[PDB]
Amino acid sequence: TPSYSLTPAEASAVAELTLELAAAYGSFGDPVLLRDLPRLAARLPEGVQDFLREFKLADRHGHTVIRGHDFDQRRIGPTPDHWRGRVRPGPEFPEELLLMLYSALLGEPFGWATQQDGHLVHDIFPIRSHENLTWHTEDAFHPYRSDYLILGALRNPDHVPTTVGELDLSSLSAEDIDVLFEPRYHIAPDERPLGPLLYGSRLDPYMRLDPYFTSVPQDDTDARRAYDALFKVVDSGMREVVADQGDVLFIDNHRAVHGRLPFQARYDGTDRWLKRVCVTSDLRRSREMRATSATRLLG
Amino acid sequence: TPSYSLTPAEASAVAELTLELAAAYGSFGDPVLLRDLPRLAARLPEGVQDFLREFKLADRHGHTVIRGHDFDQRRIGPTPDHWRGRVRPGPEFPEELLLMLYSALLGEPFGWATQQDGHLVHDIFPIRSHENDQLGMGSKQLLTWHTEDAFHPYRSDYLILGALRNPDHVPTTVGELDLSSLSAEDIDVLFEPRYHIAPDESHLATIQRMIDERPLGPLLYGSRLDPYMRLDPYFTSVPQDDTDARRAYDALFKVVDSGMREVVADQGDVLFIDNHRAVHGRLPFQARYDGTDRWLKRVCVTSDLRRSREMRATSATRLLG
Ligand SMILES: [Fe+3]
Ligand SMILES: [Fe+3]
């Protein structure tokens, strides 16, 4: 599974670009940043742009990583104790813009009005309040779910990995695949009540899988069996991928499940800190759930 | 209706970019070109980039034109007698790349495997044996309006039409939906799965168990306050019992028919069509068949290449079927 290691010159060029940008927009608010985003993304190092696009276009791998970003730890500051109540944009605004630029290379950034206050870039760090994660397709129930996740690791001193599992077809039978291609399954939130678990090409299928929230009508034994077989193959295939400081992990939400592994936090500002941006290939597809034509939040 | 008008200096910058790219790349058969496409597109004048981006994101207008490109007539050469058998790419390769660049601004170019030898940029010019047809290479016959591939879940999101020449100013017809001409009651109905749209014999896996099942679908979708549409009056079927749906369709057909605009894509005009917000066609005209005839290039744009994966041979092909 491909990765890209940045030269310091690429990293410095990325840093310099996002810092400049940070001083020229001062918010995800103004629609002009949202407008200029893909043009800005073309100011990224060219091999970085070409690598990402090859990943998107090859439509082959579950994830890739661009590593060796320069994320200034002094400028970024301590890992916050909460994300609610912070003055945004923070010191880490450049890094947030970096992921917004990457999102514009894959498609479009979007969010949910309900999730993390409606911020297009959200925070993943330990909170002392929320001290209490298996694996899944992000928002498997939703037809307007993300096409890619982008996870930028601002810091990860203890090297806590993300689980990422692709789909190994060879260990399934033509029968189960056929059955998994049929609207015979229910996936629950957090017309058309049933749907398929596999779609796309029958020879290299896409998946939407959320075990905890996946049930199948009791009388349909074939669908129960194919689902259990699929779950087992994906669970057996799970890999651990570490997003270290300066790494940006890209997850293809149609080709890979993802999960967090538990770890012990210090709660002192040294803890793992990731940023997340959800990516859609088509913003207009979710139009019915967006208050306006311009808003990138669903709900 | 918005439009952008290039200064000769911008058109010259665009001209020499496309010539640079034509020299640098083999064809569209070049997978590295297809890869570099959006990076390359960012080299176009920034006013042009921002314009198309505002059009895309505004998601309001059914079409726009970028006017004033320099399409070097002597370099492009005579309009062909056919599209078949031409050495590919031809001298007009820079103009093809131009459209591919715009396609990368809006989304992804894609083709149909069985149309024009699988070329990602189509030719539109009169061919004598095609005189009686309602198709691109037609002339005499009125191209009646429609959403492109209304019945199809993987129809284009955008059409790009580039006029290499249009000496007699034959207009393209494009019609949008004037919402204030529909009653609320009618809009609500047209949003409901109450219509069948019939396949064309050109696209006759899933599409199979869709032709088979004849599923009722809507004619309007997206936002109720500013809806997208798929409307092909030739293929649109309404169940005879459904009085409300028939009434609603008659109204929709009515309003769209009343709103047909004549848009002349003249030499150097690139016309952009939102296949979710506008129907299209072309007025009849008389061809000269001498090599001076109206010649347009066409690129089809998808916002999501992977949505049509089931109907593409490989992961890498941009050709459906
Ligand atoms: Fe998740
Ligand atoms: Fe058409």
Side-chain angles (χ1 to χ4, degrees):
Chain A
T1 171
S3 86
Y4 192 94
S5 290
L6 296 164
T7 59
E10 285 169 307
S12 182
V14 171
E16 272 178 293
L17 170 62
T18 56
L19 270 173
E20 168 202 310
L21 258 42
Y25 294 94
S27 176
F28 297 118
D30 67 328
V32 44
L33 165 67
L34 274 30
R35 182 199 69 150
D36 295 333
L37 214 56
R39 179 158 52 71
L40 273 16
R43 286 173 68 195
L44 281 178
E46 302 202 326
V48 172
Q49 285 179 237
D50 290 347
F51 177 85
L52 253 208
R53 185 135 164 102
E54 279 171 347
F55 162 71
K56 162 164 162 197
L57 288 183
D59 190 22
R60 197 196 306 169
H61 306 276
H63 72 278
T64 34
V65 198
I66 301 170
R67 13 183 55 119
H69 290 95
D70 176 19
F71 295 153
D72 185 1
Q73 303 290 115
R74 282 162 179 266
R75 179 183 51 73
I76 278 153
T79 309
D81 328 285
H82 293 91
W83 63 263
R84 295 202 84 185
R86 288 190 75 229
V87 166
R88 307 288 281 265
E92 84 278 13
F93 191 36
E95 287 64 50
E96 297 180 318
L97 283 149
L98 175 56
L99 276 22
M100 293 289 272
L101 291 184
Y102 283 141
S103 80
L105 291 176
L106 291 179
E108 297 292 343
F110 81 101
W112 311 84
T114 54
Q115 288 184 40
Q116 289 204 26
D117 280 29
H119 292 117
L120 284 163
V121 190
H122 38 239
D123 283 293
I124 298 156
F125 47 73
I127 305 152
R128 214 172 326 206
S129 326
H130 313 251
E131 26 83 68
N132 40 293
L133 282 141
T134 44
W135 53 262
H136 68 281
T137 298
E138 186 69 70
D139 303 305
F141 67 94
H142 212 292
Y144 310 145
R145 66 196 177 271
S146 49
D147 300 299
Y148 303 92
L149 306 327
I150 298 179
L151 282 310
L154 308 192
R155 70 178 54 102
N156 194 356
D158 299 307
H159 309 117
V160 178
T162 303
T163 51
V164 182
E166 299 187 12
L167 171 258
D168 179 47
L169 210 62
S170 61
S171 41
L172 288 181
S173 73
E175 336 285 293
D176 291 43
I177 303 167
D178 283 346
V179 177
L180 290 154
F181 263 81
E182 301 190 13
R184 296 170 74 169
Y185 309 88
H186 185 250
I187 305 158
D190 197 282
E191 37 75 48
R192 279 183 280 184
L194 296 147
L197 293 185
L198 306 187
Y199 51 103
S201 151
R202 217 140 310 208
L203 299 149
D204 190 22
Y206 300 134
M207 57 191 269
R208 61 184 186 110
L209 201 45
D210 198 331
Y212 202 79
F213 292 87
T214 301
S215 63
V216 42
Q218 290 173 18
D219 276 42
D220 190 348
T221 67
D222 311 90
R224 168 56 61 132
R225 266 45 166 158
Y227 165 56
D228 287 321
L230 174 70
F231 166 95
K232 178 160 284 206
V233 175
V234 174
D235 193 59
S236 284
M238 297 303 301
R239 313 293 149 90
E240 293 194 4
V241 186
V242 176
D244 281 323
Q245 189 190 117
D247 299 348
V248 174
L249 169 65
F250 296 90
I251 298 173
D252 175 353
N253 195 45
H254 293 293
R255 288 197 177 278
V257 293
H258 67 277
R260 169 129 92 275
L261 296 160
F263 63 97
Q264 175 63 69
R266 266 99 46 172
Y267 304 105
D268 56 21
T270 318
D271 286 303
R272 189 179 185 256
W273 186 3
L274 313 204
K275 294 293 197 170
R276 208 227 312 200
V277 181
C278 301
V279 190
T280 177
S281 296
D282 186 3
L283 200 46
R284 297 211 297 173
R285 204 168 54 103
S286 62
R287 178 64 250 244
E288 64 158 47
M289 275 177 205
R290 298 191 286 102
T292 59
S293 164
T295 188
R296 296 170 173 270
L297 298 182
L298 284 59
Chain B
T1 313
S3 69
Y4 193 94
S5 278
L6 292 154
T7 73
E10 280 165 301
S12 198
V14 168
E16 65 201 46
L17 171 66
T18 54
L19 284 157
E20 178 184 331
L21 268 32
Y25 294 95
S27 66
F28 322 106
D30 211 339
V32 33
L33 170 69
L34 262 28
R35 182 203 70 181
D36 294 338
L37 224 51
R39 174 157 63 69
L40 271 21
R43 293 175 65 191
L44 293 161
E46 291 186 12
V48 164
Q49 283 183 248
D50 288 352
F51 187 79
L52 283 175
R53 180 82 176 152
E54 286 173 55
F55 163 72
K56 175 186 187 170
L57 288 186
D59 180 29
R60 215 289 97 205
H61 302 284
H63 77 288
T64 32
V65 185
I66 300 179
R67 328 196 104 103
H69 297 86
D70 174 40
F71 296 158
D72 191 329
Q73 299 303 112
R74 296 163 169 37
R75 176 183 46 78
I76 282 147
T79 297
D81 284 340
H82 209 121
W83 61 265
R84 291 187 135 108
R86 293 184 66 223
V87 192
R88 225 77 170 91
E92 82 285 356
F93 186 43
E95 289 65 54
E96 290 180 329
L97 289 149
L98 177 58
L99 305 194
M100 296 294 279
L101 292 176
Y102 290 137
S103 75
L105 290 179
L106 291 168
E108 293 298 336
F110 81 93
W112 300 90
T114 64
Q115 283 166 38
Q116 292 186 20
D117 279 354
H119 299 138
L120 285 178
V121 185
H122 309 265
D123 281 288
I124 300 160
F125 53 77
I127 292 163
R128 206 181 219 118
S129 39
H130 289 222
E131 205 181 56
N132 296 322
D133 300 344
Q134 293 186 241
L135 302 162
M137 328 315 280
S139 69
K140 285 247 276 203
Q141 300 305 319
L142 169 70
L143 265 286
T144 80
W145 60 258
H146 72 134
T147 297
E148 185 80 352
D149 308 297
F151 83 93
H152 212 295
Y154 318 124
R155 68 192 174 278
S156 296
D157 298 306
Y158 303 91
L159 294 328
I160 295 168
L161 305 182
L164 305 192
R165 58 182 62 105
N166 193 345
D168 292 298
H169 313 106
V170 191
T172 303
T173 75
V174 22
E176 297 185 38
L177 206 206
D178 184 357
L179 232 206
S180 70
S181 298
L182 289 166
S183 70
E185 192 191 358
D186 279 343
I187 296 148
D188 288 346
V189 179
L190 290 155
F191 266 78
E192 293 186 325
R194 297 167 77 162
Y195 304 92
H196 188 245
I197 314 154
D200 192 8
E201 74 164 64
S202 303
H203 321 296
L204 220 308
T206 291
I207 73 290
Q208 268 308 300
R209 16 190 247 79
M210 219 192 86
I211 305 161
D212 290 1
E213 288 191 15
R214 268 176 67 88
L216 297 152
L219 294 179
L220 299 185
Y221 45 103
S223 160
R224 202 147 310 218
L225 309 195
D226 210 338
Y228 307 130
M229 66 168 167
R230 71 204 177 119
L231 187 52
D232 188 317
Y234 215 89
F235 300 149
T236 304
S237 170
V238 191
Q240 68 139 208
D241 287 4
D242 200 332
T243 299
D244 292 7
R246 299 239 229 105
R247 192 200 66 246
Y249 170 83
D250 278 346
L252 177 68
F253 170 81
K254 166 183 87 195
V255 173
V256 170
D257 207 39
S258 85
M260 300 304 306
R261 309 284 140 102
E262 285 187 27
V263 176
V264 185
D266 274 319
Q267 178 187 141
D269 303 351
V270 184
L271 164 57
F272 294 86
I273 298 174
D274 178 349
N275 192 54
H276 293 267
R277 289 191 168 284
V279 299
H280 71 268
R282 183 197 61 233
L283 299 183
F285 70 100
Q286 175 76 99
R288 264 76 110 273
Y289 299 116
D290 59 10
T292 70
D293 287 303
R294 200 178 173 266
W295 185 5
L296 325 200
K297 296 297 191 164
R298 189 214 252 221
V299 182
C300 296
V301 187
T302 178
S303 277
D304 190 12
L305 195 47
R306 298 209 291 171
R307 207 160 93 95
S308 65
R309 174 69 188 87
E310 65 169 348
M311 231 208 304
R312 296 187 283 109
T314 58
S315 264
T317 196
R318 292 164 173 270
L319 295 165
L320 280 62

